[PDB]
Amino acid sequence: LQMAGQCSQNEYFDSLLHACIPCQLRCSSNTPPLTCQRYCNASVTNSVKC
Numbered sequence: 001l002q003m004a005g006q007c008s009q010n011e012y013f014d015s016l017l018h019a020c021i022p023c024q025l026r027c028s029s030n031t032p033p034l035t036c037q038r039y040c041n042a043s044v045t046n047s048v049k050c
Helices: none
Strands: 011-013 021-022
Touching: none
Parallel strands: none
Antiparallel strands: 011 021
C-alpha cells in the first residue's frame, strides 16, 4: 500500500505500476480512460470547432 491516500487529481493508481498515473498519459493515446473518460474529454478538447 504505497501512495494509497494522496493521488493527483484524477490520478489512477495502476496496480500493475504501483503509482497513481494521470489520465493524460492515456488520454492522448490508447483511449483507455474508463474512470477518466470524463476527464480525458475535459483535458484534450476536440470536435466542433478548434
